[PDB]
Each structure stands twice: as structure tokens, then as C-alpha cells.
Design a protein around this ligand. Structure first.
Ligand SMILES: *[C@@H]1O[C@H](CO)[C@@H](O[C@@H]2O[C@H](CO)[C@@H](O[C@@H]3O[C@H](CO[C@H]4O[C@H](CO[C@H]5O[C@H](CO)[C@@H](O)[C@H](O)[C@@H]5O)[C@@H](O)[C@H](O)[C@@H]4O)[C@@H](O)[C@H](O)[C@@H]3O)[C@H](O)[C@H]2NC(C)=O)[C@H](O)[C@H]1NC(C)=O
Ligand SMILES: *[C@@H]1O[C@H](CO[C@@H]2O[C@@H](C)[C@@H](O)[C@@H](O)[C@@H]2O)[C@@H](O)[C@H](O)[C@H]1NC(C)=O
Ligand SMILES: *[C@@H]1O[C@H](CO)[C@@H](O)[C@H](O)[C@H]1NC(C)=O
Ligand SMILES: *[C@@H]1O[C@H](CO)[C@@H](O)[C@H](O)[C@H]1NC(C)=O
Lengths: 323, 113, 172, 262
């Protein structure tokens, strides 16, 4: 009924970043954490429901609006979106007969972690989506018995064609005052869709990135108003890869704990997770924008301007970062 | 054991299903092909297409009826001639409870000259 | 407190559509077909449900906007297979008819019923014999009863209807 | 209760307005993101559907949100049960979107305690084929005289049998319309049986000639018997006594056998 706090979980995951090279992907990280509610049970089920303010009667219908959002992101061909999912379960895992047809076609592919398990993970990623080498050699060790994977790909094209590139064009622009601060946010819409790419230039990025939120970003996406403007934008390429483990023990600690892992629906024997890792990307060209991201949750492994990509009405915060 | 509803070359291959219990609330309805294809998934009036499928080959001509889901595949093809996997992922909303109910009624359609 | 009035509505043809004067359109309908009508309230629901035992009424949209969905389509052989023209006849005070009348329950006949063979047994105890070669339905149930009728006719004729069958048996 | 009244109009879109619902209690202090409507949606909102800003209310006339679609193309649209939308009791048709710290539980307690929110479903149009009018309109465009304004399922050059019933009688009264011949090409048995009776009443007309050439090859038996009956009492014909009951330009007055041997 409401995927309200779902986006904020990824937003907060960006907040705890202390660096200067960011392509963070909130949608990829949040999707794996929320939908992992399926095998959770007992103590683990109640803790995640407390997280996102989901009353336990409301599980179920949450999946429905997610489906509506996934379909709504595809409304054309020039600018579209993609999303896939895939998990992994070992042969030695005592899978309940109920699950082997309840969600057989979703995932839960069987394999063995001790016979070229890295290659087994590899062969399924490229079929589901356009990812290339989300895996790494040191991902697995002697205690690996589970895995899970997410994926996002993007493609967009500007509304007003391009004309350090300076463009004289009619557009929406104004000045924003967060708190004793001055930025001139400039909206750059796309074509035949309702998604866009934003801009902002300033000096103290800490006062800017510490309050980024889908809630407040709407309040900044409308103060912009139509009037003739003249902006400059370069071509570049950004990169980021980091870790999420240290920022996860506050939300669902028991999933990592082998003693507190209450996963009693998929399987009865104990099982637990260790870490997770993320690899984000973005490219910039003249015609439009290209964006990409992925996520793994497995045992082991001045004056700049900020870019933000956002859907207009749904609120699914796509990749954000600084240049 | 449902009889195989059969149609002719390139016509309305109108398949159908049916649930048992009315008071149980449907959370999702999906249309698969055996064993794992997911021809298309849907919910309410919004249809989420999978892989290579759009409105030209399958539509959802029961968007304002919740008793039975039906499909109206046009321009029938030999590729479309196969086993079909209906789906009613079920849940109960009387009070707070943990339960899932996967009801399946697989139907076959055969096309020939 | 601001106050605003909705702009003047444009009444589309959906809203003026009436359930009556439609019985030359409702009767022609196949299985699992949603014949859209106007807003049908409970005032007419009982008389239309008896007039249409072949339809389950379902709610389509807001304001009682509904449409009669036909789920079963059976042809009562006592009339249909003998009176070829009547694809939909009524039952007024226990009598078959051809025009629409009030109160008379409506019943149609299975489409191309002579391609199905439902009334072959009833007809046994020019019109239906000519449907032999039009048996392109290829149904498993229909074919077995077809050859049952063919063998029975062949033997009973060997030992008017039989006389005509000899003429039909040129290239059928 | 409610005290703040700031409508806070925007610059990007005049429809986008931000009613600042500032109640007395500090946590009950939120500025919502709603929008109104003042457009004419001759264009399309989403592929196959239209989503205006009018949050329809239960117990109210369904004619409200059919205003905003431009006519002479709205004749293809029908309504459905929309997703549960909340409106303003003081702003009939206002549509509030879910964002910020506003939650359905928070507004549900708001509306239940004090009714400034009108429950309902968002107006939601679905495109399909055209719809049909009355019996006279069935007479008009099924007879292929005005091949517009009615569903293509009727205008499909006599492909489906829904308008078979009426023009059966119309063709019985007058076989003059060439569109009757097109319907004879539709390859249906009830149509052949009914009009062949008209053919058996008057056979000299040329309409019976192409009747033999169109549908008779499919159903030889019924046409041949009816033709045999006509010449039984009408023996004044000068071509129905050639190898017939009263015993090579036209074969309309003969069985299928006689022409093959010659
Ligand atoms: C979300 O984003 C979508 C795009 O993804 C936005 O919709 C676009 O809106 C713009 C501006 O209104 C459109 O741009 C212009 O649209 C015209 C193209 O034709 C349009 O009108 C046709 C009307 O046809 C009528 O009659 C035919 C029968 O002849 C019927 O089939 C129709 O239903 C109509 O009754 C439509 O068929 C056609 O689809 C278009 O709507 C034209 O003036 C210009 O060339 C220009 O393209 C744009 O086409 C819309 N759609 C798309 C896919 O790009 C939408 O507003 C956004 N939602 C928001 C902002 O809330
Ligand atoms: C950017 O400016 C920040 C301002 O402080 C922040 O905002 C004020 C209003 C208070 O809420 C305060 O607690 C916040 O921390 C500085 O903290 C920050 O260091 C500045 N950035 C850099 C890189 O120096
Ligand atoms: C399921 O259907 C069967 C078969 O008619 C019936 O016996 C049973 O009661 C149904 N279950 C319900 C209604 O819960
Ligand atoms: C079901 O029980 C829950 C508490 O467990 C309660 O909130 C709810 O109102 C109950 N439903 C009905 C229909 O009584």
C-alpha cells in the first residue's frame, strides 16, 4: 500500500558515505533488504517489520504496489528501465517441498558451492540483465551456503537537445535557501517520459548531502520555475565501489548472527549471512544519460556540482552522486 | 483434470481459471508457462511484462473482474501452443495470520490446421 | 477555506445506455463476453437474472456500472434443433415464441449446434443430415457420437429420412 | 483542528498546489502535495489509460470526470474501480499524493476524527473498441451504410455474427442492398436458410444468382431443396423444367450434379 520508507532506506545508506567519488544506487540496496522478508521468520520477521513501519497485517499487499511501480517505469522505448532478481540455494540445504513450487520460477536455483561456484553465479547474471562481472574471485570461502543478487539498468534521453558546454534554452530555474545557503538548482527533463536529471552547484557539500531525502527533494523539484536560463555542463564519467556491512547491524543484526538467525520457512537447519558489497556506475554523453548498478549480499569478497536522477510522480529515487 | 479449451488458427485463445474460497483476498495473479517462463505477470489493472512480451500478443481482458483471471492471446502461434500455468497467490485477511496458498489449475490449448 | 465547484460534466453515451431495448444485442453474445450496459441497479436485478439464467451479473465500475457475463450457453433441444431459424426463443406462459415479450424467460441456442451434435439423439426419435460434412469442429466428444449415428443410420436404412440419406450419400 | 490555510501555489504547474494542513498539535503539522485540474485532456496520460487530478467520491454522480476529456474521441472510454484515493471535503475532486512524512494511517485518523477528507477512487479510463447505441443504430451501421461511430466488431465486413439477427429480417424485406451480398460472403448457415426462403418466394431476381455462387457450395442441401420447392407450384418459369421437377447461361436453377458431367 505504501513504498514510502523503502526509498529512504537506500537514501540513508548513501548518507553514511564519507568520500568524494559517489555513484550510489539507493534503489538497488533497498530492494534486496525489503524483499528478504520472505525466508525471515520468528524473531527476524518482527525486527524488519519494525524497521519500515510495516504492520504485520500489511505484508502481502506491499508486493502489489511494488509490481505496479516496476511496470510503470516502462512506458516508452527511447527511455525505459529494467530490474531482475536471482538467489542461490545449495543442494545440501533441506528445502521444504512447499517452497519448491510456491516460488520455483522466481529463483532459488540449486547448485553446489564447492565446484566452480564463482562460475555458477556468473552464468545466471548476464541472462537476467545486462550486468557484466558483478562477482569477484575472493567472494567465497569454506562456510558459504547461501547467496542473493540484485540488478538495475537505466537509459534516458534529454528533452531539449544540447546546443563545459553552454546551452541557451528556455527552462525552469530558481534559487534555493536550505539554511543560510545558496544553490541554483536546475532541472533538466527527459523526453517522452516523466523522469529527469537534476543539477546543483555550491561550496559546502556536507550541508547539501546530509539532508538529501525523497521527501525534501520534491520540495526542491517544484520551487524551480520556468524562465530563460543559460547553463554549462561537461562530459565525464564517475565510478564507485564500497561496502555496506558496517551500516547494517542497526537494522537487521540477527541475519548475520548464526545464533539469532530465525530463518525457519525456507529451511529448518540453521543458516546465516556474513557481508555484502556494491558496485555502481554512471556514464554521461551528449544525446542523453546512461546509468547502471548492481548489488551482492554474500559471505566475503572546490565548487563541484551534484547530479540526481528522479522519477516525477512515483518517487523511486534512482542513482544519485556527485561529480 | 480441467477440460482442455481448444480454439482454432489465430483466434481468441480465451483461457480461464477459478478459485474455491471467496472470502480469501487475492494478493497477486500471474500467468506462467510450464516449467519456468512467466509469460506475463499482472495485478489489478496494471500488467508487468516479462522479457519479450507487450500488448500486441497478450492483453488482460478481465481487469474489472476479480473472480476469475482470463487471457485473450491474439494471432495464435505454435510457440504459444503449450502448457499454461495459472496462478492465484492467496492470503487471508480476516485477522493477523501467517499463511500462503498457491492454487494452480494448469490448462492446455492445442492449435492445428 | 477555499471552495471550488466541479466543471460541467459531459454525459457520454455510456450513461444514457439502457438495459431495455437491448434484447436484440444482449442475446447475440458468446461465452465470457462482457456486453457493456448502463448503470444497472438492484431494481431490475431479479427479473433480469430470471430472464437470463445464463448470465452471472458482475460489478464493473463505480455507481453500479455492470454488465451481464454469459458463463453457460445451452440449447434446449425441444425447440432449437427442430425450428432451425430460432437462435433465441422465449418462454411466455409455457409457450415458445419468436418476438420478445415481457416476463418471458430468454433462452438462446448453442452456436452452430449442428456442428456439435447435441440434438442428434433427439432428432433420431434434409435439415440435420446435411450437417454431416460440416462437422469440422474436430471435438473428441462430437466425433464419437457422429460415427455412432452414422453406423446406426447405415444399418437401420439397410434393413423418407433413409430415402433422402441415399441421395445425400454421393460425396458427403 | 485545522488552522493553516496556505494554498502555496507553484511556478512549475498551476495545477500543483500545496495545501499546508497545519493543525493545532505540533506533529499534526504537514504540508501536503496535492494538485488540481484545469486542462482538456485530448492527449494521453499513460498508454491505454487516463489519470486526471479528479479523485472521484463514492455516492456522487459519475458524470464529473467525463467533462475533462475532449468529445468526438471520448466515445471509446469506460470507467473502472480505481485505486483508493483521498480527496478534500472542501475541495471536491482534489487528489492528494502520498509523500513526505504523510502516511495513510495518519490521514485515516485525521478523516475519522474530523471529516475533511472524502474517500473514493481515482477516475480511471480504459480504452477499448467503440460501444453501441440502440436497435436503430444496429440497423444503420451493420447494414454497411455508415461505417463509422460504432464498434469495429460490427464494422468488420461481416466477420462476427452479433448483428446477424436483425439484418436477416431487413434482407428478407428487401434484398436490394449489395451489403446483403457481403453478409452472404460471411459464410454462415442461419443467414443462408432465412434468405433462401425469400429466394424461394421470388427466384427471377438476379440476387438469387450470386446466392448460388457464394454460399451454396458450402451448404448444397438446403438451397437445392428450397429451389426444388419453388418450381413445384411456380411452373411458369422457362428454365426450371430442364432436368427438374416439371420434366447454359445460369446454374442458379439447378443442382450441383448437372453441371459437372457436362
Ligand atoms: C508521462 O509521460 C508521458 C510520456 O511518456 C506523457 O504523455 C505525453 O504527453 C505529451 C504532451 O501531451 C505528448 O506529446 C505530444 O502528443 C501528441 C501525440 O499524439 C497524442 O494524441 C493522440 C490523440 O489521439 C486521439 O485519437 C486517437 C484515435 O485517432 C486515439 O487512439 C487516442 O486515444 C486519442 O483519443 C494519442 O493517440 C497519442 O498517443 C498522443 O497522446 C502530439 O501532439 C505531439 O506529437 C506530441 O508527441 C505525448 O505524445 C504523450 N505520450 C508519449 C508516450 O510521449 C504524460 O503526460 C506524462 N504524465 C504526466 C506528466 O502526468
Ligand atoms: C557545512 O556546514 C555545516 C553546518 O553545520 C550544520 O548545519 C547547522 C545549521 C547545524 O544543524 C549543525 O549541527 C550542522 O552540522 C558544517 O557542520 C560542516 O562542517 C560544513 N562542511 C564542511 C565540509 O566544513
Ligand atoms: C473447495 O471445493 C470443494 C469442491 O466443491 C468443496 O468441497 C470445499 O468445501 C471447497 N472449500 C471451501 C469452500 O473452503
Ligand atoms: C482481526 O483481529 C485483529 C487483531 O488481531 C483486529 O485488529 C481486526 O479488527 C480483526 N478483524 C475483524 C474483522 O474483526
Amino acid at each position: 500500500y505504501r513504498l514510502q520508507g523503502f526509498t529512504n532506506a537506500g537514501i540513508v545508506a548513501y548518507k553514511n558515505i564519507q568520500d568524494d567519488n559517489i555513484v550510489f544506487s539507493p534503489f538497488g540496496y533497498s530492494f534486496s533488504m525489503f524483499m528478504s522478508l520472505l525466508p525471515a521468520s520468528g524473531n527476524t520477521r518482527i525486527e524488519l517489520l519494525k524497521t519500515m513501519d510495516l504492520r504485520k497485517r500489511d505484508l502481502g499487499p506491499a508486493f502489489t504496489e511494488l509490481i505496479s511501480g516496476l511496470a510503470k517505469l516502462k512506458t516508452s522505448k527511447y527511455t525505459y528501465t529494467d530490474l531482475t532478481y536471482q538467489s542461490f540455494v545449495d543442494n545440501t540445504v533441506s528445502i521444504k517441498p512447499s517452497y519448491y513450487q510456491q516460488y520455483h520460477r522466481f529463483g532459488l536455483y540449486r547448485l553446489n558451492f564447492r565446484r566452480d561456484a564463482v562460475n555458477k553465479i556468473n552464468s545466471i547474471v548476464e541472462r537476467r540483465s545486462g550486468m557484466s562481472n558483478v562477482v569477484d574471485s575472493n567472494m567465497l570461502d569454506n562456510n558459504t551456503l547461501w547467496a542473493i543478487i540484485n540488478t538495475i539498468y537505466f537509459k534516458g534521453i534529454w528533452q531539449y537537445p544540447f546546443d563545459m558546454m553552454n546551452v541557451v534554452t528556455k527552462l525552469q530555474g530558481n534559487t534555493i535557501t536550505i539554511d543560510d545557503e545558496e544553490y541554483d538548482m536546475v532541472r533538466l527533463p527527459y523526453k517522452d517520459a516523466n523522469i529527469s536529471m537534476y543539477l546543483a552547484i555550491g561550496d559546502n557539500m556536507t550541508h547539501f548531502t546530509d539532508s538529501i531525502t525523497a521527501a525534501k527533494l520534491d520540495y526542491w523539484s517544484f520551487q524551480l520555475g520556468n524562465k530563460v536560463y543559460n547553463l554549462k555542463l561537461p562530459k565525464f564519467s564517475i565510478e564507485n565501489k564500497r561496502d555496506i556491512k558496517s551500516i547494517a547491524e542497526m537494522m537487521a543484526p540477527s541475519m548475520f548472527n548464526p545464533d539469532n538467525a530465525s530463518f525457519k520457512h525456507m529451511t529448518r537447519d540453521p543458516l546465516y549471512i556474513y557481508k555484502m558489497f556494491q558496485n555502481a556506475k554512471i556514464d554521461v554523453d551528449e544525446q542523453g544519460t546512461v546509468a547502471e548498478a548492481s548489488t551482492i549480499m554474500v559471505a566475503t569478497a572546490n565548487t563541484p556540482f551534484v547530479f540526481i536522477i528522479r522519477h516525477d510522480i512515483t518517487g523511486f529515487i534512482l542513482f544519485m552522486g556527485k561529480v | 483434470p480441467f477440460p482442455q479449451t481448444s480454439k482454432k488458427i489465430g483466434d481468441d485463445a480465451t483461457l480461464s481459471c477459478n478459485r474455491n474460497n471467496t472470502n480469501d483476498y487475492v494478493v497477486m495473479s500471474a500467468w506462467y508457462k510450464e516449467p519456468n517462463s512467466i509469460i506475463l505477470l499482472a495485478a489489478k489493472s496494471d500488467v508487468l511484462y516479462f522479457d519479450n512480451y507487450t500488448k500486441d500478443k497478450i492483453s488482460y481482458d478481465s481487469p474489472y473482474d476479480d473472480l476469475v483471471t482470463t487471457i485473450t492471446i491474439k494471432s495464435l502461434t505454435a510457440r504459444d501452443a503449450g502448457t499454461y500455468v495459472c496462478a492465484f497467490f492467496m492470503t487471508s485477511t480476516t485477522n493477523d495470520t501467517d499463511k500462503v496458498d498457491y492454487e494452480e489449475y494448469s490448462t492446455e490449448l492445442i492449435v492445428n490446421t | 477555506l477555499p471552495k471550488r465547484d466541479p466543471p460541467p460534466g459531459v454525459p457520454t453515451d455510456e450513461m444514457l445506455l439502457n438495459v431495455d431495448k437491448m434484447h436484440d444485442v444482449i442475446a447475440p453474445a458468446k461465452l465470457l463476453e462482457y456486453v457493456h450496459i448502463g448503470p444497472l441497479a438492484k431494481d431490475k436485478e431479479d427479473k433480469v437474472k430470471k430472464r437470463y439464467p445464463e448470465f452471472r451479473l458482475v460489478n464493473t465500475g463505480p455507481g453500479g456500472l455492470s454488465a451481464l457475463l454469459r458463463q453457460s450457453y445451452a440449447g434446449t433441444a425441444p425447440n432449437c434443433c427442430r425450428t432451425f431459424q430460432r437462435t433465441h426463443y422465449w418462454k411466455k406462459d409455457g409457450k415458445i415464441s419468436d418476438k420478445y415479450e415481457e416476463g418471458a424467460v430468454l433462452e438462446s441456442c448453442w452456436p452452430d449446434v449442428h456442428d456439435t451434435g447435441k440434438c442428434d439423439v433427439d432428432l433420431f426419435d434434409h435439415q440435420w443430415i446435411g450437417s454431416a460434412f460440416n462437422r469440422a469442429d474436430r471435438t473428441v466428444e462430437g466425433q464419437q457420437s457422429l460415427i455412432n449415428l452414422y453406423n446406426k443410420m447405415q444399418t437401420l436404412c439397410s434393413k423418407p429420412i433413409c430415402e433422402s440419406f441415399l441421395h445425400h450419400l454421393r460425396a458427403h | 483542528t485545522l488552522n493553516r490555510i496556505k494554498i502555496a501555489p507553484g511556478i512549475a504547474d498551476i495545477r500543483d498546489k500545496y495545501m499546508e494542513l497545519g493543525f493545532n498539535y505540533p506533529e499534526y503539522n504537514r504540508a501536503v502535495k496535492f494538485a488540481e485540474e484545469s486542462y482538456t485532456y485530448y492527449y494521453e496520460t499513460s498508454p491505454g489509460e487516463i489519470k486526471p487530478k479528479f479523485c472521484l467520491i463514492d455516492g456522487m454522480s459519475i458524470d464529473h470526470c467525463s467533462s475533462f476529456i475532449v468529445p468526438e474521441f471520448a466515445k471509446q472510454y469506460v470507467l473502472i474501480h480505481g485505486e483508493p484515493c483521498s480527496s478534500f471535503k472542501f475541495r471536491p475532486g482534489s487528489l492528494i499524493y502520498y509523500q513526505n512524512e504523510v502516511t495513510p494511517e495518519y490521514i485515516k485518523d485525521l478523516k475519522h476524527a474530523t471529516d475533511y477528507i472524502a474517500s473514493g477512487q481515482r477516475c480511471h479510463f480504459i480504452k477499448k473498441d467503440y460501444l453501441l447505441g440502440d436497435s436503430d443504430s444496429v440497423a444503420k451501421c451493420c447494414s454497411k451504410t455508415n461505417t463509422k461511430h460504432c464498434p469495429k466488431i460490427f464494422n468488420n465486413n461481416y466477420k462476427t455474427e452479433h448483428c446477424d439477427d436483425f439484418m436477416t429480417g431487413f434482407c428478407r424485406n428487401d434484398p436490394g442492398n449489395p451489403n446483403c451480398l457481403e453478409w452472404l460472403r460471411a459464410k454462415r448457415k442461419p443467414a443462408m436458410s432465412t434468405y433462401s426462403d425469400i429466394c424461394s418466394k421470388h427466384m427471377d431476381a438476379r440476387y438469387c444468382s450470386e446466392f448460388i455462387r457464394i454460399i451454396r457450395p458450402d451448404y448444397f442441401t438446403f438451397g437445392d431443396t428450397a429451389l426444388y420447392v419453388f418450381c413445384n407450384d411456380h411452373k411458369g418459369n422457362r428454365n426450371c423444367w430442364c432436368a427438374n421437377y416439371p420434366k447454359s447461361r445460369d446454374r442458379k436453377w439447378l443442382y450441383y450434379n448437372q453441371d459437372v458431367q457436362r
